[PDB]
Structures are given as C-alpha cells and as structure tokens.
Write an enzyme that holds these catalytic residues in place. Sequence first.
Site, short mmCIF file in Angstrom:
data_model
loop_
_atom_site.label_atom_id
_atom_site.label_comp_id
_atom_site.label_asym_id
_atom_site.label_seq_id
_atom_site.Cartn_x
_atom_site.Cartn_y
_atom_site.Cartn_z
N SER B 200 0.82 -1.21 0.00
CA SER B 200 0.00 0.00 0.00
C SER B 200 0.86 1.26 0.00
O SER B 200 1.61 1.50 -0.95
CB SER B 200 -0.95 0.01 1.20
OG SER B 200 -2.14 0.73 0.90
N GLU B 331 -9.06 -5.61 -4.52
CA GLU B 331 -8.33 -4.48 -3.93
C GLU B 331 -9.27 -3.49 -3.25
O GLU B 331 -8.86 -2.83 -2.29
CB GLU B 331 -7.50 -3.78 -5.00
CG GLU B 331 -6.24 -4.53 -5.41
CD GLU B 331 -5.14 -4.44 -4.36
OE1 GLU B 331 -5.30 -3.67 -3.39
OE2 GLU B 331 -4.11 -5.13 -4.52
N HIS B 444 -7.54 -5.99 0.37
CA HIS B 444 -6.29 -5.25 0.37
C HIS B 444 -5.49 -5.52 1.63
O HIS B 444 -5.98 -5.29 2.75
CB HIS B 444 -6.62 -3.76 0.24
CG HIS B 444 -5.42 -2.87 0.18
ND1 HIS B 444 -4.62 -2.75 -0.93
CD2 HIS B 444 -4.91 -2.01 1.10
CE1 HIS B 444 -3.66 -1.88 -0.70
NE2 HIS B 444 -3.81 -1.42 0.53
#
Lengths: 540, 540
Positions: B200, B331, B444
């Site tokens: 991330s 995601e 995610h």
Amino acid sequence: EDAELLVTVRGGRLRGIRLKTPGGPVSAFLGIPFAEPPMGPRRFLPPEPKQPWSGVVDATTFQSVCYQYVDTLYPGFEGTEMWNPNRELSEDCLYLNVWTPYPRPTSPTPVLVWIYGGGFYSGASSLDVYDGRFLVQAERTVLVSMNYRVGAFGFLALPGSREAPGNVGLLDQRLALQWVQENVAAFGGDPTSVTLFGESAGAASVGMHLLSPPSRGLFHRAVLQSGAPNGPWATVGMGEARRRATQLAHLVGCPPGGTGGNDTELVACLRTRPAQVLVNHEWHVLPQESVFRFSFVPVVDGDFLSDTPEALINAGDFHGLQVLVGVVKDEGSYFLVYGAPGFSKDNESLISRAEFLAGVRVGVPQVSDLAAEAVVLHYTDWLHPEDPARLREALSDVVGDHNVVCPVAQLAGRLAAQGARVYAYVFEHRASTLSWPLWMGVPHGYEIEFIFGIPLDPSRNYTAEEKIFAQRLMRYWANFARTGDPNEPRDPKAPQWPPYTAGAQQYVSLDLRPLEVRRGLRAQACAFWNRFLPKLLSAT
Amino acid sequence: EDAELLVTVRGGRLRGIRLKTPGGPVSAFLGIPFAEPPMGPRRFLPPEPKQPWSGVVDATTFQSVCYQYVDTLYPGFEGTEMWNPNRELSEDCLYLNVWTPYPRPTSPTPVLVWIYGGGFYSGASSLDVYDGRFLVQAERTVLVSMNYRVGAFGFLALPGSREAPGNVGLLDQRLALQWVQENVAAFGGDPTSVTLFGESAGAASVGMHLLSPPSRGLFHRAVLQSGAPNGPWATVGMGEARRRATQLAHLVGCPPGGTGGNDTELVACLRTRPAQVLVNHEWHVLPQESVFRFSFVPVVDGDFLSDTPEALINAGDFHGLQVLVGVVKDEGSYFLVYGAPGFSKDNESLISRAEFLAGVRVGVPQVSDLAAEAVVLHYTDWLHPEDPARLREALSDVVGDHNVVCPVAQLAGRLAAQGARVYAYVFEHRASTLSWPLWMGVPHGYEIEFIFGIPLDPSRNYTAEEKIFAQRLMRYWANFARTGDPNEPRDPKAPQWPPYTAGAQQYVSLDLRPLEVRRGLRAQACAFWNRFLPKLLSAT
Ligand SMILES: *[C@](C)(O)CCC[N+](C)(C)C
Ligand SMILES: *[C@](C)(O)CCC[N+](C)(C)C
C-alpha cells in the site's frame, strides 16, 4: 384455370401471370398502377391516386424502376449487381405487385407487404431476391410489394414549402397501403390482417409508418429487418435538408445566374432538368466523407413525423401491436469497402492501427475528437491493440452497432416496455452461394434471400440444408403474419421463441441449428451509443 | 551462542534477542535508534542521524509507535485491530529492526527492507503480521524494517517553508536506508544487494524512492505490493497540502486570534500543541466524503520529487533495475465499509442501484458528473443493471481499479518498456482464518501474512496447504532479492514466471494451485482510467 389470372380492382381490370415453383403454381399480378405518374409538374409532389382505366391492364411483368443511382464500385460483381435496377429507369414508376396462391383463397388471408431497402436512394420491387412466388406457395399467404420514389425524387425537401415538401417517397408507400385496404380482397387477401416487413431503409420506413397516425390504421403488425427509424442515417433536420436541396440545385445550374432563389423558383428550375442530371450529382451533397450516409432521406418537418423518431418512440403507446425485429451477424462489414481506408473486397483488408483510427471518423462522421476517442476506447482490444484482424472486425462493429444494432435494440426495448409484443432475432447463417469475401461474415441484407425462399429455386446451387432452413424462416414469418407469434401454434416439438422484453432482452439465433435463446443485443456496446455518447456530445 | 546477540554498529553496541521458529532460531535486534528523536522544535523537520551512545543499547523489544490515528470503526474486531498500534504512541519513534539468521552468515547476504503501509497515516514495524523471523529462518536472508513518521508529523507540508517542508516521513525511510548501507554488514548483510519491499503506502514509498535520485543509490531492487506512487491517493499538490495544513492549524487554535499567520508562526503554534491534539483533527481536513483518501501524504514540492510521479515515471531510465509488482484479487472491497452507502461488514452489503450511483461519487471524488457517468457506464452490467450482488462487486472494482490495479499496471508497463525487468502477480488465495466477511474476497493487505510466513506460527490455525503456500512465496521473494528473478535459478520442476512486458503483459496467479500465466492487468478497465478518463477531465 386461366380465369384466376383475371381480376377486377377499383380502377379497372387486370390480367396476371402464372408463376412456377417446385411445389406448385402461384398467380402473380406485376405492375399494377396505384398512382398517377409523378412527372413534369408532379415531380417532388405527393402522389395522386391512379385514375380508373378502360380495358384490361397487362400485369404480367414488372414495371419501371424509379430513377436512382446505379452502383459501379465493382462492375460485373454479383454481390453489388443484385441490388441494381433490373428494369428500365423512369419517373413513371409507381406500380405495385400482388402474389396470391393457386387456387385463389376462398377465405380472407393475411397479407404480407414488402418495402425494399436501399438507403432511400435505390431499390426496386422487381429484384430477383424479392421474388414472392416461393413465400406465397409455401405458406399460402398474400404478398404485396410496391415501388416508391427514392433519392431526390422521393426525399428532396425544402421544408415549409409546397413545391417540395419532402417525404413524398413515404407517401408513395402509404398510398400503396391504402390501395391494399381497398383492393387486396379481390385477390383473396384480408385487409384486417396486414403485416408490414422491410429491410434496411425499408425497415426504417416500416418504423416511420408505426409513428405516423395516418399510416398506423393501414396495417396491424410490423417486421423491421436490419433497420429502424431512429438510426442516425434514416432522418435529417430541416436545415440540413434545405442545404442539401440547395446545393443539388446549384450543381445542376439552378437558379440561373442572375435569378433569385426562393423555394418556388428553385423547384421550378429543378423540374426542368432531366432526371439523370439530378442523379449524377446526388452523392456530391453529403457534408463529409462517410459510410452508411445518404443524401436524401425522410425529413423531420412536423407533418409526416410529428417529432423526431426518437421522441415519438419514447412517448408512444404500442398496446395491441406485435413487432418482429432483428439483425444480421455482421451489419457493418458491407459498408467498409465504400470509403473506409485500407478496405478491399478482393483482399483480407487486414488494416493497420492508423487506418482503424481514420476509419472511425468515416464510420462515425461529424462527432467531436473526444467522441471518437470514446469510440476507440470501447472498440479497442487493449491486449491486442494493433492486431489487423481484430481491428477489421472492430471497425465492422463500430459501423454496425452505431447504424443498425443499437438503434434497433433501442427501438425494441421501448416498444416492449410500452405495450407492444416484440420478438427479436439475429441471423447467423452465411449463404453457401455468397460472393462477398469471407471476412465480411454475414453482411447486411443477406437474410432476405432466405426469407423469400430463394434457395427453393431449382436454377440455383443452394444446399439441401439451406432449403429446409428457408422453409423454417418462411414458416416463422408467416406464423407472425397470421397470429402475431412466430412460434408454431400447436407444435411444442420445436424450441420456442420467447418474446423480447426490456428486462430479459431475449432473442434467438437463426441458422441451420435449432433455435437457441440468448440475452442482450450487444447490451454493453449499445449502452455506449444509446446512453453515454449523447451525454458526451451535449457537454461537447 | 549468546555471543551472536552482541553487535557493534557505528553508533555503539547493541544486545539482541533470539527468536524461536519451528525450523530453528534467528537473531533479532529490535529498536535500534537511527535518528535523533524528532521532538519539540524538531517536529515537522527532516530527521537527523542518531548521535553515538555509550554502553549497550538494549535491542530486545520493539520501540514506540509513531503518533497516529487508531481505527475504531469495529472495536474488538481482529480484521481492523491487527493494523492498530501494538506499542505505546510517541514522537520518539525513529527506530529500526534487524533480523538475521542463526548462525550469523559468514558471507555477505542479500538484504530485504520492509516499509509498512497504512495510507501514510498509520502503521508500525512492530505489528505481528510483519514478524520477520520466519522469512529469515526459511530463506537465510537479512531483513530490516523501520518506523517512519506518519500523519501530520510525517507529511504536514507548508511548501517553500523551512519549518515544515513536508515529506519528512520519506526522509525518515531514506535515513534508515543510509543506516543499512553503513551498518548491515555487521549483521552479515550485503549492502550491495538491498531489496526494498512494501505494501500500500509502503509500495508507494518504494516507488517514490525509485524516482528520487538521492535514495536510488541506497538499493538495487524493488517490490511494490498493492501500491504505486502514481496512485490518486499517494501524492498531493502544493496548494492543497498548504490548505490542509492551515485548516489543521485552525482546528487546534493556530494561529491564536488575533495574531498573524505566516508559515513560521503557524508551525511555531503547531509545535506547542500536544501530539494527540493534532491526531484528533486529522480526518476533518479532507475536502469531501471519500474512501481511499488520506489527509497528509507526500507532496510534489520539487525537492524529494522533482516532478509528479507520473512525469518522472514516463521520462525515466530504468535499465539495470529489477522490479516485482502485484495486487490482490479484491483491492477495493476493504475500503467500501469506510463510507460507501449501504455497506456493512456484518451483512451481505447487497446495495441498491441508487446506493451504487452514490457510492461511485465517494469512490471517485472530485470528478465531474460526466466523469461519474463514464465510470457508471463502464462498470454497469447492462443485462443486470440492478442486481445487488453485481453492483457490490462493481463498486469494489471501481475503487480497486482506480486506486491500485490501474496505477500499478501503468507503472509496470512504463518500467518494462524503459529498461526495467518486471515481474507481476495477482494474489488470489483467501486465508482460511480471515475474519472479514466472505463477500470481500481477498481484501487489500491480506497477502502480507503469507509473504512473512505467518502460517508457520504454531500458535495459529492455518491449514497444511497454506504453510506450503507460504514457503513457496517466501522463496519467490527471496529468489528475487538474491538474483532479481523469482524463478528457481536451477529448478525446472515448477512452471516458470515470465517477465512482464508492455506488449504481452504476462503475470502469474498466486494461490494454492501451481503457477498459472495470464495476460493483462485488467487491460480493458485500466484503459478507461489511464487513457480515456484524463482526456475527459481535460475537456470539462
Ligand atoms: C439500407 C440502409 O437500406 C441498406 C440497403 C442496402 N442493400 C444493398 C442491402 C439494399
Ligand atoms: C494503503 C493505502 O497503505 C492501505 C494500508 C491499509 N492496511 C490496513 C492494509 C495497512
């Protein structure tokens, strides 16, 4: 006997001819005059009914083809010559044909009425591919087809004027439909069961008759094959129609140098020119380089059409109406050899990426550069963005979806959702005899020969399988004309054809295989044309 | 022995701790100071190197977590609290950790450097899911992870000023990389083979170190997991960063009314406020309702980044660089419960059409209404435009593609086409112990526990196949750190991982099944985000 070849209509007496089919004879009446010849001062004017005649009019052969441009892109080629005039050109061209079974039906029979296509600039009821003898023999229906004025002679419009009001070609068709109401009973036909059907510009004409009140009472069912009145090519605005009419006058020397140019003087000079002179400049009035665009088409003037076809479709009540619509598998491939760069019927037309981007502007004329970019985005495979074969099929989809599939799917959805019972198809069989190249697939207009039972002609080289297939399609079309339902009314053996709805969007495949049901007529691509692209152009 | 738990670095001496794994022990040095504590007058300032110390610094436990917001959306929930701080908060937080195998390597060993994510507002190297004992034991590499200032303390920027230049959190990471260059050899690590990897915001951090010359010399390979520096959330403009810093000051009473407000007095008042007070107003400076947007992120100032990440990526030479990038299967699903209407982690989130259209404005903030229309067109299934389950997965795709997948695919293509050797993956295994709802799929951040070999922890309920799966991924990552190629340098048993190219766009699926090669990182959807949508926003 020979007594069935003599019929009296309201205008006088006719003598028809007996036609042969492998399954039995039919009685044909070819060349019945339904209007006064629209010549001299009557050029560009609405048709007048044919005055009654003395004696026996001979109705044993097709009459003249209305004056029109003749395709010369491929001289001697069957794929183009089959649509060209096969009779002499003349403005004396408002004649219709009636096929009826032998023996003549004793009971009133449902009537099929054919309206040929040809982009409103060409076409004729006398083409071999519109031969109605096989459909009438196999299904014992009554078939009628008429000639209507095309090109400038049918759709040259100076809106608001009285010398050239426009849409007179559509009025020709309406007068033929009024003739069917008053005379089809003499042939054994039921004027209370009249089914319109046409292809391309004929399908658009059928749609415009649905949306015109004076024509709506003359028929009861509709079939639109590969065309719709809401297509971007089927109509033009009043200002654009006036500009095209004026430039045609300029190209033929009207008005003379030193003369004013009000509408009456302009049409008056226009009426003095030989008909061929007007035809020879018809294509030189289009505003851009284009494919699937035609110079003189129906005008949105407020008379024949109260509003745009799109507006009248949305605000329309279609309860009590049955419609059959459909498309072919490759609607756009035919038009690409008429202006798209890199395309040729005599090679594989494996175009480059640069030729694809240029072709998008020709296939989608007069849209913003951003609009073209949106078209390129939706129709590019971004995993193979430069594969020529994929780009060739993509541009075919661009032209086909923009012009046929998505206007048809839009019409079909609004019809079903607003009271009409709708059936949809996609024609996916490529004729074994097809002379166009293989990469064109199933091109625009090549379901007609199967609907009319042409494979039954013993002089042709169709397969045995294609003949059975033609009989299937003739049964479908006749069942719809009889009952409003293409399914066999008491045959549950065959796979059933479900209606088309705005939600399920069901249609069936038409090929040698049995019926197969699918959902969505290119729903993803047609959401781009029907929903997003209008919003993109309004925001410029 | 215990002798391996004593190490001398350039600043002084350290005492580490031995950690147990089922395969054998490792030696860890947790809490090594690499910077002076950025306290008092040093708040918002770039880090300074840690001054040398007397005696033996105890390096047996993790140090403090940098001040940050703590998630309270789902109190007591494992799926959220696994990312919350597990040590006390403090601005005295610039410490790093070094895991090294037992026995210590006698030859220089490739070094892996972890940069945690957390939207640049949260995160810590002490999180259980970042435990490096299993990766170091199984693959005998050296693992380093550092803390860096997040939130306002790391990325509040009044650009041009010297009191709060911004990007100091990125400078924290750079100083830790300089520390690795000068000291990792004391642990048996090769400073000439340093591989960065992060997830991330950590992946965006790795990307920004690629595009910053002063940091490019401190490492040799890069791994970007579910993040990229060109994401719409990873950077902010100078004018917007100044506005966010000024409103934070306003919310905490800076400047005191009624005194002036130039940059020096603004930061001076900011430095007097307790750290928790700044944290308590961090979210109230975002311009609109949104998901996947964070208040204080790297700013494009002209210093750390001479231009936008997009500009530097396009005009960059990446010859001699190996990169590994990838994404998870879902995601966007994680972020929808943080603002998208109709979404809940405790039900199926079967949203309505109206909720989907409203959620598009939250998932894609600050775009024109026409831009949202284009998003809706691309992500609506027009055969089932109202199906709640399809709308739920569509909005997750909107948020995932816009924020992660398409920024990553854009970066991967530009790198491969401009000299870099690239490998791509999509992580498709959902952990058996995952506490998030089933409709979120593989959310995610939930590949991290497999990269770090967490299933090897005997105190956890992972399956037998998941442990083998973790060992296989740990070898992929270590092989890439050693040789720049995730494939086995000798073994032809397993299927091979082909490099990612701008043309073929090949990537592999990471799950329990063997490697499978696929083509295209959502090529169709990412063409909309990367190609068409920028043109749509240019023409307003
Ligand atoms: C349609 C616009 O009428 C096109 C018709 C072309 N033919 C050749 C199929 C008639
Ligand atoms: C990314 C923007 O850093 C999001 C990270 C969120 N966690 C919870 C996965 C760290």
